[PDB]
Write a protein that binds this ligand. Structure first.
Ligand SMILES: [Mg+2]
Ligand SMILES: [Mg+2]
Ligand SMILES: [Mg+2]
Ligand SMILES: [Mg+2]
Ligand SMILES: [Mg+2]
Ligand SMILES: [Mg+2]
Ligand SMILES: [Mg+2]
Ligand SMILES: [Mg+2]
Ligand SMILES: [Mg+2]
Ligand SMILES: [Mg+2]
Ligand SMILES: [Mg+2]
Ligand SMILES: [Mg+2]
Ligand SMILES: [Mg+2]
Ligand SMILES: [Mg+2]
Ligand SMILES: [Mg+2]
Ligand SMILES: [Mg+2]
Ligand SMILES: [Mg+2]
Ligand SMILES: [Mg+2]
Ligand SMILES: [Mg+2]
Ligand SMILES: [Mg+2]
Ligand SMILES: [Mg+2]
Ligand SMILES: [Mg+2]
Ligand SMILES: [Mg+2]
Ligand SMILES: [Mg+2]
Ligand SMILES: [Zn+2]
Lengths: 50, 203, 86, 122, 53, 118, 53
RNA sequence: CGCGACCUCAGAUCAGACGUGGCGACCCGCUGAAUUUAAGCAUAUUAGUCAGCGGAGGAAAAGAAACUAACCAGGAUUCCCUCAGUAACGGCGAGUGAACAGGGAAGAGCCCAGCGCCGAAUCCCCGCCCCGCGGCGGGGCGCGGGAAAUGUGGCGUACGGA
RNA sequence: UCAGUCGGUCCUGAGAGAUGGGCGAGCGCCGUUCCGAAGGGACGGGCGAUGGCCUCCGUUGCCCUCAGCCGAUCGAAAGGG
């Protein structure tokens, strides 16, 4: 929909910024067990709700 | 003392003198709304013996309660169960209409606290009560030691817990062989105390 | 045409995100929330779903002010006093 | 160098304001440098400037509120923010004076019949 | 004039007092002292007024 | 005096204004949306640089709570440059991108290279 | 405080003596002890007790 | 016609306050079933239980007899043992089912209305001065305002009081 | 992903929904003009105050006088606009 409301567009904005991958320097930490970002979202598998 | 004559007169309700006053008051109160504030109590002596004092911080609310029993709020029939609980028309509420009157008066005036309530009139379909309310945050009440007990948070909403004179009657408590089913905190407390297994460590 | 073909007409949502509970249950036509009842001043809460109650309790979220009140209690809610300077 | 709050409190309001704006200008140009892409010195200095701005604002607010409550120290009605923010139940609780008020009945009762100090031989 | 309900009530109450058979114990107050005796009584009462604060 | 209309309405009474014995808040809240926090950082994209070198405008990244008038005044106070018009959009990332068209006298290239972006 | 001599009411226990609730007013007035000072000096007082013996 | 009171009811972005909602293990008030058992089932049982609604506190409620007893009498409320799976209720079927006394934990008593007696001897608010103020109080000055005689305060409450 | 001119934003349709009121043990429910003191407006006139070359006017504060409305409010990115 091209007629997005302000709140929905802001919600989509946060989801898009959350969808980025983990930086490669984090997994060099000592107490680290994050091998990858498991909560990635794809527009063809998960429809994000709404 | 005037109050002695007043209460003796009020005990003679069936006489013509009081009957004219009762019907005039009942009609006048019926013309008004269900919940309103009376600037002064209708019965001074009755208010005084219920605890009212003519000082700032005490107010009187004259409230009207629809007379009658209580039918089960279900659809037309539809008591889906055993024939014991088919009763819908001839059920009675477990609290007095006075208790209902003071609880909704207290609910409307959430800032004030119910002290007592009494009966000022009745009709075929309506009964009128006057409820005494105390402003706990008025300094004329808070600074007086003999009546500052109501200001404590323990007495929050006495009418909805059943702590007023009308509320206590519905609980069925008091000393005697006639109130064995309520010894303890209340009727439910007594039942809970009886219906437990006191399993000791050594049995 | 009861099944797969019928599913092709899903193009106008019924609920939207509630502005109080944050879940996507605010009914548009009813103008009420099926998760917390936003227009009603009292939070929707039933004892027949313990899991639903536990999912959103006092200790679930941030406790932005309550956890501050907890650490103020252990000192008795001091006010106007500061430790002596060096 | 490293700005600290010890020597900021003695500074007057206008001087603090004319230092705060310079801190804002430096933060803004450091942000511009970050966006363009520069050395790590500016990137590290961004946090320092932000904390310095925060510390200056904290000092200004503390002095302002201290002066306000000094002004309202002796008055009867004071603004809500200046009023003591304890728990709601504690605020609604009766004060020590009111709870210590005792009616003349119990006053004279304690006068006539005080609690005595006694002991009993074995 | 469509008077307010309170004005209507306080007027028809007086109408009801004039309509219903008022008992003598209540109607005795309607029979009152005359004007000249009333003002003479007030003149006498004005002598023994209580002290103000 | 007599009543002409057969209906009765509430007479208009005298109502006074607020004269509190104490202000509700001790001090007015400080303006957190000042001329420095309204604008965050100018864009350095190739598209932005192509726009500043052709249309004599500038590109800024601002918060979503800034009006076009506020942006114009903030740019004027911060950089002493007249503003012709402002066009604002909200990027899909959430930040508001503002195009600030300057007055014909000023040159966007000079303003850009003297504020840092180049 | 000190509690008085008391024997149990029922027939099953009328041969035994237990501890009482408090000293009766009649007992106190015979002993010449005021009802308000007895509690202060540590004497249990309850006004409901009678004395049929 | 108007002026001035009293009484009932309005309008206030009037000055000063309060309630709203949440947690809800425990507690108080109300409403409140069917599963199940009875080898079926309708009274009963499940059960004043689940579900539902309202209201708090650090505990709540109760509470100082319109009591228990019938003895040579005890003496607020509450909780443990015991009374007791008893008296008793029950298609007297399944089943349900207290209380008194006794031993302990704890133990604390009191206050009004009314009748009366004291010049309303009472109380609230605003102005000013002093003191400490992050539980807005104490003293003093206001022919300052108000509540109240349709009853405030002192004495005084079933154990008598004046 | 850049708008006074494209739409929303404005209006109201079927409807939905507070106040008054009534009911309800109760969360609340019914009801939308019905058991309402439902106007915060104004041509003009008078009193009093301020500013500007106190001329004349503007903002006011108070009084006189005049005044219907249909019900607060929501409801369409294809209706009006
Ligand atoms: Mg049955
Ligand atoms: Mg009865
Ligand atoms: Mg739909
Ligand atoms: Mg609830
Ligand atoms: Mg007294
Ligand atoms: Mg106000
Ligand atoms: Mg609550
Ligand atoms: Mg069976
Ligand atoms: Mg079977
Ligand atoms: Mg069967
Ligand atoms: Mg039964
Ligand atoms: Mg039963
Ligand atoms: Mg029951
Ligand atoms: Mg329950
Ligand atoms: Mg209690
Ligand atoms: Mg007694
Ligand atoms: Mg007992
Ligand atoms: Mg039973
Ligand atoms: Mg016993
Ligand atoms: Mg008296
Ligand atoms: Mg154009
Ligand atoms: Mg409705
Ligand atoms: Mg609209
Ligand atoms: Mg349109
Ligand atoms: Zn919700």
């Amino acid at each position: 929909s091209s007629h997005k409301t302000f709140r929905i567009k802001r919600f989509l904005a946060k989801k898009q910024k959350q969808n980025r991958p983990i930086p490669q320097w984090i997994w060099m930490k000592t107490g680290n067990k994050i091998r990858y970002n498991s909560k990635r979202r794809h527009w063809r598998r998960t429809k994000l709700g709404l | 003392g005037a109050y002695k004559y007043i209460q003796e007169l009020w005990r003679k309700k069936q006489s013509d003198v009081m009957r004219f006053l009762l019907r005039v008051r009942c009609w006048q109160y019926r013309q008004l709304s269900a919940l309103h504030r009376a600037p002064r109590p209708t019965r001074p002596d009755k208010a005084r013996r219920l605890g009212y004092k003519a000082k700032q911080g005490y107010v009187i609310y004259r409230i009207r309660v629809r007379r009658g029993g209580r039918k089960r709020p279900v659809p037309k029939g539809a008591t889906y169960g055993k024939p014991v609980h088919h009763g819908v028309n001839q059920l009675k509420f477990a609290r007095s209409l006075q208790s209902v009157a003071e609880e909704r008066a207290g609910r409307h005036c959430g800032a004030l606290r119910v002290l007592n309530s009494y009966w000022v009139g009745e009709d075929s379909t309506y009964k009128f009560f006057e409820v005494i309310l105390i402003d706990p945050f008025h300094k004329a009440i808070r600074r007086n030691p003999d009546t500052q007990w109501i200001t404590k948070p323990v007495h929050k909403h006495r009418e909805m817990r059943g702590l007023t004179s009308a509320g206590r009657k519905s609980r069925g408590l008091g000393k005697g062989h006639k109130f064995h089913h309520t010894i303890g905190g209340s009727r439910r407390a007594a039942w809970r105390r009886r219906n437990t297994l006191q399993l000791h460590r050594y049995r | 045409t009861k099944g797969t073909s019928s599913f092709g007409k899903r193009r106008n949502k019924t609920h939207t995100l509630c502005r109080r509970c944050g879940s996507k249950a605010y009914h548009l036509q009813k103008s009420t929330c099926g998760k917390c009842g936003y227009p009603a001043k009292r939070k929707r809460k039933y004892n027949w779903s313990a899991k639903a109650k536990r999912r959103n309790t006092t200790g679930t979220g941030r406790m932005r002010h309550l956890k501050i009140v907890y650490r103020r209690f252990r000192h008795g809610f001091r006010e106007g006093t500061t430790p002596k300077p060096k | 160098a490293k700005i600290k709050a010890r020597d900021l409190r003695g500074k007057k309001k206008e001087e603090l304001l004319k230092q705060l704006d310079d801190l804002k200008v430096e933060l803004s140009q450091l942000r511009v440098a970050k966006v363009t892409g520069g050395a790590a010195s500016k990137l590290s200095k961004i946090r320092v400037v932000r904390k310095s701005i925060a510390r200056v604002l904290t000092v200004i607010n503390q002095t302002q509120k201290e002066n306000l409550r000094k002004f309202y120290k002796g008055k009867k009605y004071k603004p809500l923010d200046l009023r003591p923010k304890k728990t709601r139940a504690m605020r609604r609780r009766l004060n020590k004076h009111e709870e210590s008020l005792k009616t003349k009945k119990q006053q004279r009762k304690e006068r006539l019949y005080p609690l005595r100090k006694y002991a009993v031989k074995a | 004039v469509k008077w307010p309900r309170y004005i209507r009530l306080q007027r028809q109450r007086a109408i009801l007092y004039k309509r219903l058979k008022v008992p003598p114990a209540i109607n005795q107050f309607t029979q009152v002292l005359d004007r000249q005796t009333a003002t003479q009584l007030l003149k006498l009462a004005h002598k023994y007024r209580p002290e103000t604060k | 005096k007599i009543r002409t209309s057969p209906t009765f309405r509430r007479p208009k009474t005298l109502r006074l204004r607020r004269q509190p014995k104490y202000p509700r808040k001790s001090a007015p809240r400080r303006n957190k949306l000042d001329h420095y926090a309204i604008i965050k950082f100018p864009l350095t994209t190739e598209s932005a640089m192509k726009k500043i070198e052709d249309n004599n405008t500038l590109v800024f990244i601002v918060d979503v709570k800034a009006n076009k008038h506020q942006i114009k005044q903030a740019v004027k106070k911060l950089y002493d440059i007249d503003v012709a018009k402002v066009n604002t959009l909200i990027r899909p990332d959430g930040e508001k991108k503002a195009y600030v068209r300057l007055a014909p006298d000023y040159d966007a290239l000079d303003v850009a290279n003297k504020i840092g972006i180049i | 405080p000190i509690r008085p001599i008391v024997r149990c009411p029922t027939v099953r226990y009328h041969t035994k003596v237990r501890a009482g609730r408090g000293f009766s007013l009649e007992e106190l007035r015979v002993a010449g002890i005021h009802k308000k000072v007895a509690r202060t000096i540590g004497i249990s007082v309850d006004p409901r007790r009678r004395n049929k013996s």
